Design a protein around this ligand. Structure first.
Ligand SMILES: C[C@@H](O)[C@H](N)C(=O)O
Ligand SMILES: C[C@@H](O)[C@H](N)C(=O)O
Lengths: 165, 165
């Protein structure tokens, strides 16, 4: 029923079934993200997280996650289009764990982002990728570390919905 | 009341009030994301998007957005901690527009990510940064281009809640 000034934290979700594909060296000009995502959609591949940060104007990288089971079809589809897309490498990592703090009103609580990263750091978990929104802080880590990341996060946030002050 | 197999699209949100801070060359080992976010939280700065993609193990970059009005205090706070954080540069861009497609159940619809990027590309908008989740596809673009990005997205998605097939 909670589904207010402080964030609402509802759980720690954990996913062992994804792979990360990174398109490296994409021209940073209009229509290149489109080529990548249409190609992946054309091959009927379902993507989860997508991230594209700051560029080297110039060239940049695009990472997305998808199911391990379709990871190779996505990479093959993309490479079949290397000329049109113009990338220099594709990176593939099928040994990722995805761990998220799930919630609502999680925005402008950097203090919450910090607490998340401190708890993983306290148990030696390296954060490979971060994406946030209103409803989730998600990070990738080695799938081996996923268990302790989940326990760390439970402890750090006291986790039934929680209003976290 | 809509708040199902196809995504729900509810609007195009547009924001001219943010700046993007990128921490460049952060050691990619446990506890560095923590240092950055605690420092920003210690200075009482409210962050919105956060992104950290694939690294150069090694070193990596962390981008976040915040209000233009506190952008310089955040950069100053971070630089006051350059020794402890270990970064090589901070990039600051206070001329960003943030444009998002807002929704629900937006995951595993790459076809939707593609449609978003095609509409911006059709009107010449360069995508500088992308972050997605269940409830939003957000991109940064030049704040000059924000108007046409918003119109493009309205057209492309036919936008009152919409169930988009
Ligand atoms: C890199 C990719 O996002 C490119 N800037 C585009 O607009 O398509
Ligand atoms: C780069 C930063 O995310 C680092 N990997 C950490 O775990 O703190």
């Amino acid at each position: 029923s909670i589904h207010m000034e402080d964030p609402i934290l509802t759980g720690v979700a954990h996913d062992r079934s994804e792979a990360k594909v990174t398109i490296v060296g994409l021209p940073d000009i209009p229509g290149y993200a489109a080529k990548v995502f249409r190609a992946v959609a054309d091959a009927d591949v379902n993507i989860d997280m997508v991230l594209q940060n700051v560029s080297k104007d110039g060239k940049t990288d695009i990472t997305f996650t998808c199911s391990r089971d379709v990871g190779p079809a996505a990479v093959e589809k993309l490479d079949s289009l290397r000329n049109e897309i113009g990338f220099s490498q594709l990176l593939y990592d099928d040994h990722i764990g995805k761990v998220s703090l799930i919630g609502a009103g999680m925005r402008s609580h950097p203090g919450v982002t910090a607490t998340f990263c401190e708890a993983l750091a306290a148990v030696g978990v390296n954060i490979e990728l971060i994406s946030t929104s209103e409803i989730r802080i998600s990070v990738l880590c080695r799938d081996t570390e996923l268990d302790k990341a989940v326990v760390a996060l439970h402890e750090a946030f006291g986790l039934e919905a929680t209003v976290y002050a």
